[PDB]
């Protein structure tokens, strides 16, 4: 279970610990242990990015609903147009799965 | 081509397989194998982040447009200064 | 921004390791990775803090729309979407 970016700081600090332990008394098993740790840190980095991406997708949904609110109340299409173009573009260049 | 975060998931599983093999039977060839796959998974991560940072600035520009519209149509100055301050306190952090 | 340098540095070190695997090279690569992962975590951290400020801006925006008199239907829609973002938001 990924809980937040503190998972990333804790797994990074553990990796820094292994690193100094490696450079002090190098050894193959220490090298494998560093790689093991790197994989744990990377697995948590990936989990964070997936969350952030879903987050931004959900932000786009809120932004679309907001544009609808402004339209449902009679705001000028002159104004809505610029917002609709920017959101269209963002929806195109959005990082997704 | 970076297609999305599914790339990160796919390069990560690959690195995990390499790691299991390395751990059941270590070897110098697999250690370099793993380090190569780490640089790969990391390159894609840097690609996703790059894309997220550009996405984020696009989101902020849309927020500014929304707030500028709100002012145009006569929202109250209390909430208006409240939103403009949030944007300024974001502009600092960036 | 400075994420680039940390990745390029790491890809050049990978070359030197590719040609003549040494304990020196391997350890250099790992340290270079740690630095790259350090930059990557820091970038993610900044992004996560900024999205929590984006959430607050969205809340205030929804309040300005309710204040002006947006229909309950679209309003509830917006309130539900932000509640869902708040619940799934990446944080510390």
Author numbering:
A (entry chain B): 0 to 96
B (entry chain C): 0 to 93
C (entry chain A): 5 to 96
Q: Any passages from the paper?
A:
We used de novo protein design to generate very closely related proteins that adopt two very different states—a short state and a long state, like a viral fusion protein—and then created a single molecule that can be found in both forms. Inspired by class I viral fusion proteins, such as influenza hemagglutinin, we chose homotrimeric helical bundles as the fundamental architecture. We decided on a design scheme with two divergent conformations containing a constant six-helix bundle “base” and a variable portion with three inner helices and three “flipping” helices. In the compact “short” state (∼66 Å height), the flipping helices fold back to interact with the inner helices; in the extended “long” state (∼100 Å height), they extend to form interactions with each other.
The interaction energy between the flipping helix and the inner helices in the short state was tuned by combining hydrogen bond layers (“A”) or hydrophobic layers (“X”) in different orders in each of three possible positions. Designs were given three-letter names corresponding to the layers in order, starting at the hinge proximal position. We sought to design calcium- or nickel-binding sites in the long state by introducing aspartic acid or histidine at the key hinge residue position. We also designed for structural ambiguity in the turn—with the result that the secondary structure prediction for residue 75 is mixed helical and coil, but with low confidence. Crystal structures were determined for all potential bistable candidates (XAX_GGDQ, XXA_GVDQ, XAA_GGHN, and XAA_GVDQ), and we chose to focus on XAA_GVDQ because of the presence of a bound calcium.
